[PDB]
Paper text:
In Gram-negative Escherichia coli bacteria, FtsZ recruits cytosolic, transmembrane, periplasmic, and outer membrane proteins, assembling the divisome that facilitates bacterial cell division. One such divisome component, FtsQ, a bitopic membrane protein with a globular domain in the periplasm, has been shown to interact with many other divisome proteins. FtsB and FtsL are small bitopic inner membrane proteins (103 and 121 residues in E. coli, respectively). Previously, the structure of the periplasmic domain of FtsQ from E. coli has been solved by X-ray crystallography and shown to consist of two subdomains, named α and β.
Our crystal structure of FtsB bound to the β domain of FtsQ shows that only residues 64 to 87 of FtsB interact with FtsQ. A synthetic peptide comprising those 24 FtsB residues recapitulates the FtsQ-FtsB interactions. The structure of the complex between the periplasmic domains of E. coli FtsB and FtsQ contained FtsB residues 64 to 87 only. We showed that this subdomain is indeed necessary for the interaction but is also sufficient, suggesting that the remaining residues within FtsB are disordered in the crystals and do not bind to FtsQ. In accordance with these data, it has been shown that FtsB truncated at Y85 is unable to complement and interact with FtsQ, whereas FtsB truncated at D90 is fully functional, and this is also supported by our data showing that FtsB 64–88 binds as well as the entire periplasmic domain comprising residues 22 to 103. FtsB forms a helix, followed by a linker largely in β-strand conformation, leading to the final β-strand that extends the central β-sheet of the FtsQ β domain by binding to its last β-strand. The only helix resolved in FtsB, approximately residues 65 to 75, makes a number of charged interactions with the rest of FtsB and FtsQ, most notably two salt bridges that may be involved in stabilizing FtsB’s conformation (E68-R79 and R72-E82). Both salt bridges are also involved in binding to FtsQ via D245 and R247. In the FtsQ-FtsB structure, FtsB Y85 is oriented toward FtsQ L226, a position that was previously shown to cross-link very strongly to FtsB. The complex represents an exciting target for structure-based design of protein interaction inhibitors shutting down cell division based on peptides or peptide mimetics, as the FtsQ-FtsB interaction surface is small, the 64–87 FtsB peptide is water soluble, and the interaction is easily interrupted by single mutations.
Residue numbers in the entry:
A (entry chain A): 58 to 82, 90 to 260
B (entry chain B): 64 to 87
The structure:
């Protein structure tokens, strides 16, 4: 059972593989599946046996693009997985939120909207879809955008077209923009906060 | 409830007090 692991490890420790093999008390198919079953952040694993007494293991992990709800994570391709927080918390990632089957759907929004916002240097820190399919975004500068259920792109354009006049308005009265609520035909409501 | 606030703003152009409204 002498062990040689190949692959781009970021989350999986040696001791995870050691303790998956030790867990059985052997066959290359059984242990591949067992690594799968005990490491939920493994996407692919191939286990080739090798003389003398070696197990050469190829590991492919999921690669989070975002935290998903809070405890979990989601990769670019819509995969929902979990890493124990101990190994996750030095990372700074965007937060996605959705009801439990909806990662692919939230991620699709997240891409479209984040991409639009990137074109004027706003970046998405959180994006939250509700069961109702209402959308509430958080920018890096902690401005929350309330998009509701409708045309989210059109309302997001409103925010961008209207942001400069809010920033001088905020400058003047010496206050930060707290949120922008775009649940309107053609308008937007702006909540303010004291400066930090 | 959030549904209500949403309707409150979109159908009536309501606001919470202390917010600024802009139309575009």
């Amino acid at each position: 059972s002498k062990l040689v692991l190949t692959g781009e490890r970021h989350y999986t420790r040696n001791d995870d593989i050691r303790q998956s093999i030790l867990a059985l008390g052997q066959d290359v198919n059984i242990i591949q599946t067992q690594i799968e079953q005990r490491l939920p952040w493994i996407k692919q694993v191939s286990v080739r046996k090798q003389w003398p007494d070696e197990l050469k293991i190829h590991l492919v992990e999921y690669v989070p693009i975002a935290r998903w709800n809070d405890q979990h994570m989601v990769d670019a391709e819509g995969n929902t997985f979990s890493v124990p927080p101990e190994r996750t918390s030095k990372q700074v990632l965007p937060m996605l939120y959705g009801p439990e089957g909806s990662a692919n759907e939230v991620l699709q929004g997240y891409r479209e909207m984040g991409q639009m916002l990137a074109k004027d240097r706003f970046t998405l820190k959180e994006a939250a879809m509700t069961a109702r399919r209402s959308w509430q975004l958080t920018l890096n500068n902690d401005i929350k955008l309330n998009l509701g259920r409708g045309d989210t792109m059109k309302r997001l354009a409103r925010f961008v077209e209207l942001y400069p006049v809010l920033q001088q308005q905020a400058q003047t009265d010496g206050k930060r923009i707290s949120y922008v609520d775009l649940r309107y035909d053609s308008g937007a409501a702006v909540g303010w906060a004291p400066l930090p | 409830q959030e549904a209500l606030e949403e309707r409150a703003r979109n159908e009536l152009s309501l606001t919470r007090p202390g917010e600024t409204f802009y139309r575009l």
